[PDB]
Subunit: 233 residues, 4 copies
């Protein structure tokens, strides 16, 4: 039904907003102030967007997040691909629109995710993994219909999880936690240096999060039947 294309649209616009506001708030340099401010910006961007379209598409706005739900057998392979496609175009569009209204000199590299001189790509990949792992873990747990009438706003919980990822990570890798968010700055600045970290960390972290939740913490046992039936629809 049209109850599918609306979601794809939700994922496109939300991703454009997420990157537009996220990157926009990161322009400049610096420091606690800097980190604190950028951590809150991305976090509140997500909390806002999750309230805005979480009921419509589940507000993934993140390829690694969508990948998590795929292996978690909660969405079809067809939906996953489109979500990720919409997320990549949306992100690029947000970065594009951001570039068009931002004064040069302040533009910098459009907040491209970058490693710290003293951090190896190996350590950086492990950082991005842990960041995305606690992040996806919070998403799965709070989206789980099987629990709590005392959750409060799941939109904010997830947003603050993203903020926590930044408060810690920015010092190491600028905190990617999202392939699409990393990709947009890279494709427009023509700089794919160390970009592998920002696809690998999240995907693996997202993978370990889903697995850890569904197959150990609070098992959601699906029969091989449904798995394929879902991965198909």
């Amino acid at each position: 039904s049209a109850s599918f294309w609306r979601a794809i649209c939700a994922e496109f616009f939300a991703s454009l907003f997420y990157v537009f506001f996220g990157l926009g708030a990161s322009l400049r340099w610096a420091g606690p102030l800097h980190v604190l401010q950028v951590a809150l910006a991305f976090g509140l961007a997500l909390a806002t967007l999750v309230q805005a379209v979480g009921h419509i598409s589940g507000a993934h706005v993140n390829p690694a997040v969508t990948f998590a739900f795929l292996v978690g057998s909660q969405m079809s392979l067809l939906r996953a691909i489109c979500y990720m496609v919409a997320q990549l175009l949306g992100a690029v569009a947000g970065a594009a629109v951001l570039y068009s209204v931002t004064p040069p000199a302040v533009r910098g590299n459009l907040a491209l995710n970058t490693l710290h001189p003293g951090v190896s790509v190996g350590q950086a990949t492990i950082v991005e993994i842990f960041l995305t792992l606690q992040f996806v873990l919070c998403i799965f747990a709070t989206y789980d219909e099987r629990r709590n009438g005392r959750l409060g706003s799941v939109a904010l919980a997830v947003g603050f999880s993203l903020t926590l990822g930044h408060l810690f990570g920015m010092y190491y890798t600028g905190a990617g936690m999202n392939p699409a968010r990393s990709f947009a700055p890279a494709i427009l600045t023509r700089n794919f240096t160390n970009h592998w970290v920002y696809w690998v960390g999240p995907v693996i972290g997202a993978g370990l999060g889903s697995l850890l939740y569904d197959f150990l913490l609070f098992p959601r046992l699906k029969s091989v039947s449904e798995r394929l039936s879902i991965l198909k629809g």
Copy 2:
């Protein structure tokens, strides 16, 4: 019924508070610290006011927001006009009372919305549009009775949306997102320079937000009948 004049009163007092506390917290200069602090101040002012009178008038406290609900066919043309009238007088009053208790030298221009030297009015109008667009989008989505038992506090969601608007926007336009909030400082400092941006951006953004929500994301299909019936009451 009197269940109409109470709301107008709600919109008047809330607007006076919103501008009084919002502007008051913006006095001085500066920087992350500055932005972070002012972003939170406006955001918590709104979250507070939305809890205070959201059940009474819907706590629009913003002309562009009210305009959004008009074209969204959720209020009558009569209510909209009064809301906006109450919002403009309330704002001016808040700025007035703020001026009366604030020491000169610190008064400055009473936190008048201003463009960054390197930002054209065109880019500034597009910024204000995006700010108000994600803002109204969050308002519509969270006010929508058709969704979530997991929303948490809608008052805070909207407040944090406003904070996000500031964390990004202040650097560009000081972040208006509200004609009344921009107007009060302008009418009292007799400075309407670039004021057009602060009416145009929000109104258009507010317009694109409502349209985007009601006519694409989660369509609320009203028959031409009701539209006029509502725009009339």
Copy 3:
């Protein structure tokens, strides 16, 4: 019943905690950082305490707040007096315990509420009034059983209202918004300079808040009968 002395105890301990953590976090000087940090500290102290004992005593932890509920005919004159008595002793105790574990040199004046050199006591009284007014207004609205299933945490709403009061007020009067919180530092440092502001502003603001809510925004019409019956119990 004992369902009265538990509340008095709740108000005593909560007040000791409120002042202990509130003042403790204010030691030193400074600036956004300073204000932001102290605003959040008092705010989260209250949100925490309101969750801790709001169901037991309503968590007034504030004489001006209790006064608001008295004139609002929601508590007896007997309860009000005891609450305020417990709040004053609790506060002093918190400041006392704070003094005993804090290193001198850092102690300063134990975060005594103070006016800004350029702010007259008249302007300062009007500031404290507005601060306490939006504060009590938020308390009444969020405690009102007659509304919202979308309030979220009222504990946090009120806490953030207090934070907003500080983000704006600290620059003017250090932000009292609470006679007991102002009193404790004064009685122990033997400095009652301008102390009148910190009793007068809140009480009046608290008074205007209750009146504004119960007699105009969302009238809670009590017959003269009940008023006295309540003011008596």
Copy 4:
């Protein structure tokens, strides 16, 4: 049942995350900025983890917290021991993994809890006590099934309680409030100087919190029967 080993696992992973992100965000020095940022990091780490596994193990992720529930007769002596065991190994593991991905020079002492030169261990023990006391008090009150449909997110309430503990405490003792969180940095840096404070304060504070709640504020009267029956299972 397996509805016991999942919880132990929950407590292990959550503790590893808590310390990994908590310590990681504390690396460096400094100041409001520093404190504010670290306070929020620990706070949001907990709020996140409480949402992630609070429904599975109650998300104690803290020996002093678990001890509180033991004397509160809410868990068996067998569960308590395992929880604390899982919490200690989890913490050490988190600090270990943190060390492996963090650049030296920035590693410092891995955010080891430390006293301020001007603070005696006696004053420091009293500080840690008060910090953990308001903390446990908030936990008990918000976990209490006997109250509120207006609590909002208990995960966030507790998290913000932890943040408040840091906003005040870091200046004194770096804010331990958690034996496991203090232990991990100590065992790996081979520095147990003043470590006694970080086990004694929390345990006593946690003890006074439970007692204060269950035996005075909102008594949860258990017959000697059940007490032992529970302490046994």
